[PDB]
């Protein structure tokens, strides 16, 4: 006679992650780069989300139930209750995540055709480049122990990692942020991993990010944003 | 009083690779996996293409005239003369460019709109994951030096390679394709790198391809479409 209460117990990551607010999209998620992309999309386009904490130190994202939503093992994901066509939505990628959410509120990805393109474009360039190369930068100067003695892979990594920081640098002169004057999902998905290069990852000095003052000023635009700082706490880590 | 023939000369990439056929599709390429992604997919949807061969012998991506369509100074990049809203559109990022051929003309995505995002989502794992780690263990394994003694980091990827491989094999279980029944852009993102892997890299022993026999069965029949030979072979060597 009338609807129930969301019911998401078909996706059987809700047996670990039980969602109280199951009328809310589930980010399953940890606050390190890729899982900062999401939950700030989320907060600077106000959806409302129910956040859970996919703990490391308890190997949580290799459970059955985690890999369930993504089987590569990798946070972040979510399930959005009301997706497209009126049924759930699960999904994996942050890059895949923020072109998601902007096209269903509308917002943070430009609205003319060719712009789109370009805004998937500069996402994808920092899904295959920026992401991959700063983070093996930041295993081999940060993690990697002392049976790493060699450190030509680091420095093929800081090489890389500069290189990648001289294109972000080229594009935004003359720019305020990737796409020109509006904020959007590329600077979402690229500024959480400049951040993390030169604090948690200490690769400042590799990379000499005084050298790249548009990614300075850019970077530091970002990080102020009342919205960044809600998302860069998000899944709260108690 | 009437159109001129196309004219592309805006771009300043046609100075240096001018187009023959300016009313088609320009692909500035090298048959890499990511160049191959591209040409696959204009092969496989028959949209006509001009295909220039960015030589890496002569450094030409790191040309003006190369970047000034890609910043970032890698292949596939394209113009495509008949644009969206009426106007050229210039791209690079092979994942990016993967979604705007299958907008485009409509092939090689599904038309439902969840679909749409699945297929965005495993173009995305191919971006990040596939892309990335297989490239840095063909480095280690194939083109590394002797000054890199050190295996630790080929064995890192070797590590990694297969925990993505697996992840494909799971997906690939009871599915003919990547999205099931349907042949896709996430297909032709992806098998690419498996097939440069095992082939080009001589990684295959290293990640022991024979035990993901869902990945062979479908590697095995990506490399016999007749668009895939085509695509593979383009843009021509010389
Ligand atoms: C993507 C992504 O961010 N995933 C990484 C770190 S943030 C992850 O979930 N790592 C878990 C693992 O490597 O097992
Ligand atoms: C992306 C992509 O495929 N680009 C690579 C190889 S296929 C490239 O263009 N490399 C040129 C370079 O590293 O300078």
Same mark, same amino acid.
Request: proline share 9%; net charge negative; charged share 20%.
């Given at each position: 006679?009338?609807?129930?209460?969301?019911?998401?117990?078909?996706?059987?990551?809700?047996?670990?992650?039980?969602?109280?607010?199951?009328?809310?999209?589930?980010?399953?998620?940890?606050?390190?780069?890729?899982?900062?992309?999401?939950?700030?999309?989320?907060?600077?386009?106000?959806?409302?989300?129910?956040?859970?904490?996919?703990?490391?130190?308890?190997?949580?994202?290799?459970?059955?139930?985690?890999?369930?939503?993504?089987?590569?093992?990798?946070?972040?994901?979510?399930?959005?209750?009301?997706?497209?066509?009126?049924?759930?939505?699960?999904?994996?990628?942050?890059?895949?995540?923020?072109?998601?959410?902007?096209?269903?509120?509308?917002?943070?990805?430009?609205?003319?055709?060719?712009?789109?393109?370009?805004?998937?474009?500069?996402?994808?360039?920092?899904?295959?480049?920026?992401?991959?190369?700063?983070?093996?930068?930041?295993?081999?100067?940060?993690?990697?122990?002392?049976?790493?003695?060699?450190?030509?892979?680091?420095?093929?990594?800081?090489?890389?990692?500069?290189?990648?920081?001289?294109?972000?640098?080229?594009?935004?002169?003359?720019?305020?942020?990737?796409?020109?004057?509006?904020?959007?999902?590329?600077?979402?998905?690229?500024?959480?991993?400049? %951040?993390? +290069?030169?604090? &948690?990852?200490?690769?400042?000095?590799? !990379?000499?990010?005084? /050298?790249? *003052?548009?990614?300075? %000023?850019? +970077?530091?635009? &970002?990080?102020?944003?009342?919205?960044? !700082?809600?998302?860069? /706490?998000? *899944?709260?880590?108690?």
């Amino acid at each position: 006679y009338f609807q129930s209460m969301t019911d998401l117990s078909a996706f059987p990551i809700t047996k670990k992650w039980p969602a109280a607010h199951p009328e809310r999209l589930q980010l399953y998620s940890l606050p390190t780069p890729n899982g900062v992309k999401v939950s700030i999309m989320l907060e600077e386009t106000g959806l409302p989300y129910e956040p859970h904490l996919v703990r490391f130190d308890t190997n949580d994202q290799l459970t059955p139930e985690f890999m369930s939503l993504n089987p590569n093992n990798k946070i972040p994901a979510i399930i959005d209750p009301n997706g497209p066509d009126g049924k759930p939505l699960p999904l994996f990628e942050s890059g895949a995540i923020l072109i998601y959410l902007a096209d269903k509120t509308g917002q943070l990805i430009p609205q003319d055709a060719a712009g789109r393109y370009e805004a998937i474009q500069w996402v994808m360039f920092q899904m295959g480049g920026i992401g991959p190369m700063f983070g093996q930068l930041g295993f081999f100067h940060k993690f990697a122990g002392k049976e790493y003695e060699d450190k030509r892979p680091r420095d093929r990594y800081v090489a890389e990692s500069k290189r990648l920081l001289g294109v972000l640098e080229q594009r935004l002169e003359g720019r305020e942020w990737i796409l020109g004057d509006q904020y959007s999902i590329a600077d979402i998905a690229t500024f959480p991993w400049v %951040r993390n +290069l030169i604090g &948690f990852y200490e690769a400042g000095e590799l !990379v000499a990010i005084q /050298d790249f *003052p548009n990614v300075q %000023r850019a +970077l530091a635009a &970002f990080v102020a944003r009342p919205a960044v !700082v809600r998302g860069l /706490d998000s *899944p709260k880590r108690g």
